[PDB]
Amino acid sequence: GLMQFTLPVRLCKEIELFHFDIGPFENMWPGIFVYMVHRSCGTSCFELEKLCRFIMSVKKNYRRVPYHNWKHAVTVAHCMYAILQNNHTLFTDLERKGLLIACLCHDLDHRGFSNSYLQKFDHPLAALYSTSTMEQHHFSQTVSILQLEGHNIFSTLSSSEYEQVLEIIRKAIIATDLALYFGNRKQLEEMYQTGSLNLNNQSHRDRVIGLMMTACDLCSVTKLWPVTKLTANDIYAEFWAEGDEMKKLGIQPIPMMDRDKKDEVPQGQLGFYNAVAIPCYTTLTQILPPTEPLLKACRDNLSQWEKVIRGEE
């Protein structure tokens, strides 16, 4: 009960910054996650024994894929922790509880393939879930793990609080479908600019939490250039393997997934920062002003990608 997780000094300070990299030591990531729940949510939010057992079941259910792996899940939870800690009073007790859990679970049992490849492959999951296929799977895996004996970290919540936290988690994980991000940001943009954006309207909150999930999910672009550049390599390792599988089905993949178009990567990144990342962190900064460092870091990494094209690195 009076057992506070602490981290070494360098981690203790840098884990508060948006650009923190969780490091290459896999065995510290669980404790990094508990530290963030204890500081963000409180040391009373979860029974430590149920949480530690939930985390190791979630770890065991991520695959050894190059990018959509356990390290991605903890990276995404850290970004959310940073947003929650810089926006302390704006969020409910259930929201802080649910959103760090949602982030840790948002890519559960990912295979390293897009919703598109499952649909073209005709995967069973594509029959069961026709849209946001992997994301409905990720939420279904999350419910499965909570229902393992000893694993219900929400045991102490009332029946109504329970249904509300699982609804937050569900919307949170569905929101990580990048296909739903474009329409979600446009509506938030309109509601902020016109001026009807209302954090008491539950449908409005959902949209904000949605944008935060995209923000945390894309957060490789808000890191130190070497982290951003090396994560990119793991992102393209999955995309090019999907490209190979597409070719095996007799379908030329989109250039993004074609290893034969590596040369065009720097230009593909410009598109992504301009079409997806920068709009995401801009609307996020407009709605939640203290998330500005994500936007500053993102603009910095777009500038680094322009230098690659100019041949200066």
Ligand X SMILES: Cn1cc(C(=O)N2CCOCC2)c(C(=O)Nc2cc3nc(-c4ccccc4)cn3cc2C#N)n1
Binding-site residues for 3',5'-cyclic AMP, in ranges, read 68, 269
CA distance 27 to 284: 32
Residue 301's nearest CA partner among 232, 236, 239 is: 232
Q: Does 289 bind ligand X (CB under 6 A)?
A: no
Residue 249's nearest CA partner among 69, 113, 64, 108 is: 113
Distances (CA, A) of 5 to 35, 49, 168: 6, 14, 27
Report the residue from 49, 260, 264, 306 that binds ligand X according to the rule CB under 6 A. 264
CA distance 98 to 295: 25
In the annotation, is 68 catalytic? yes
User: CA geometry: angle at 46 spanning 45 and 52, to 5°?
Assistant: 145
Bind-site residues for a divalent metal cation: 72, 106-107, 217
Stretch that binds Zn ion, among 103-111, 165-173, 262-270, 290-298 (CB under 5 A): 103-111
Q: Does 235 bind ligand X (CB under 6 A)?
A: yes
Alpha helices in 257-291 (DSSP H): 265-272, 278-287
The pattern of x and - marking residues 165 through 204 that bind Zn ion according to CB under 5 A reads ----------------------------------------
Report the residue from 95, 177, 217, 238 that binds Zn ion according to the rule CB under 5 A. 217
Q: Does 288 bind ligand X (CB under 6 A)?
A: no
Q: Does 238 bind Mg ion (CB under 5 A)?
A: no
The pattern of x and - marking residues 83 through 122 that bind Mg ion according to CB under 5 A reads ------------------------x---------------
Per the CB < 8 A criterion, the answer to whether 136 and 174 are in contact is: yes
CA distance 137 to 118: 12
User: Token pair 């990608």 is at which residue?
Assistant: 305
What are the residue numbers of the active site?
Answer: 68
Which residues would be at the binding site for Zn ion (CB under 5 A)? 107, 217
Which residues would be at the binding site for ligand X (CB under 6 A)? 178, 218, 220-221, 235, 255-256, 261, 264-265, 268, 271-272, 276
